Design a protein around this ligand. Structure first.
Ligand SMILES: COC(=O)c1cncc(-c2cc3c(=O)[nH]ccc3o2)c1
Ligand SMILES: COC(=O)c1cncc(-c2cc3c(=O)[nH]ccc3o2)c1
Ligand SMILES: O=S([O-])[O-]
Ligand SMILES: O=S([O-])[O-]
Ligand SMILES: O=S([O-])[O-]
Ligand SMILES: O=S([O-])[O-]
Ligand SMILES: O=S([O-])[O-]
Ligand SMILES: O=S([O-])[O-]
Ligand SMILES: O=S([O-])[O-]
Lengths: 120, 120, 120, 120
């Protein structure tokens, strides 16, 4: 299932629990950027997915503030869990930094992360 | 400045509480605001933003399942809160639907939402 | 139609010609209007759109190199032209900068530009 | 290193010439290799990239109209070319369909393609 410890292609660590109420809760540790140790995450997932072979839709957010550092930014991952020989969560993400209005055009990075239960 | 009710450009409404712990909790719904249009939201925000005039980074997720409906999808909004005389939350979003692998190319919509404290 | 001089919400100037073959050609520049901030663009558009009221899909690219400056980056805009008494081109864009592999996570900005034939 | 034939990870091919003026021209074949599935592409690239291990920024567009078919849509790919023994073009894409204003929310898909010089 979704609950577990996952790693993305850069070796970030995503520790998540899927609640029966559709909640995702856990911690995220980033292999990149202005980040140190674990950050709180929260999200949601479809707790009654289609039974037709489709993946399970989900998303979560990390705001990049913890007790050590504050990057004044937040990442949301939107994606789906794909059950499988090798279970995977395939996502695309948006990383918005707090900016002045003049710099808002350059506030948001986009990318795609794939997570499995094995570290690269 | 974030806690309360916000309205997007399209008719949607959300009500959120910004907790002291950096949490965002609430519900997302339609203009009409009927029970069947209401979904849990959860997210995170920067609870200690920069003091140089930058916005406040935040993000949240809604999975489009409630006790009545299930669209097998989830949206994440990633953006920033701008305070001042015309307060706004400016976002970009990713809506991922659960798909088969063959259809994963058409799984993810992208767009933008601007939220205000007053109705459009 | 599409051929003409457009401006985005930030004052950039998009001078484009829509050819009979689906080609878009022209130049993209900044508000100041100077040679050093002017760049070549090329793209494509649907030369036979639907007749049901839908917009006309289009996209184009600017590589941020000209005879004076090189930012080692390129932007693509993807969107549609909406006809009527206020013609508009609504777009989302991706701006990729050349990076090392280690920095590829932070290579791509995303945003949205709306273009009209009037200045903002 | 850009000019030539490239293959994505899902059975598409394209064929591009990278002109000394920074033009990309060519054809994109959504399948392999029937003419009903071939479309014009044009774009731009950084014709003077860094030789510091950074990728070469580029982008291109395909409008999904040819002599056989018309999906009333256009994709733009934004990315970077990475040279060497195992050369790649790493992209993120936006696929916008022409829509009515009421449907504009669901107009734009996002995703990622990775192209290699060898077939997958
Ligand atoms: C009541 O159920 C729905 O209407 C519904 C179903 N599926 C998706 C959405 C929806 C609403 C919404 C938005 O306000 N901004 C960005 C994406 C987005 O998606 C709404
Ligand atoms: C690395 O980026 C640059 O150096 C650069 C230089 N000069 C203009 C622009 C630019 C302009 C622009 C716009 O109007 N919409 C969307 C993206 C975008 O990027 C970018
Ligand atoms: O991943 S954010 O800390 O730069
Ligand atoms: O690098 S973004 O996945 O936080
Ligand atoms: O995750 S994309 O920035 O290579
Ligand atoms: O939210 S953008 O797809 O019109
Ligand atoms: O404000 S959006 O164009 O980064
Ligand atoms: O045309 S998009 O599915 O790479
Ligand atoms: O699988 S990503 O290209 O939607």
């Amino acid at each position: 299932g979704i609950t577990g410890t996952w790693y993305n292609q850069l070796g970030s660590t995503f520790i998540v629990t899927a609640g029966a109420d559709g909640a995702l809760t856990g911690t995220y540790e980033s292999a990149v950027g202005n980040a140190e140790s674990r950050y709180v995450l929260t999200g949601r997932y479809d707790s009654a997915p289609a039974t037709d072979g489709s993946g399970t839709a989900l998303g979560w957010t990390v705001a990049w503030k913890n007790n050590y550092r504050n990057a004044h930014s937040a990442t949301t991952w939107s994606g789906q869990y794909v059950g499988g020989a090798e279970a995977r969560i395939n996502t695309q993400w948006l990383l918005t930094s707090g900016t002045t209005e003049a710099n808002a055009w350059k506030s948001t990075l986009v990318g795609h992360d794939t997570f499995t239960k094995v570290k690269p």
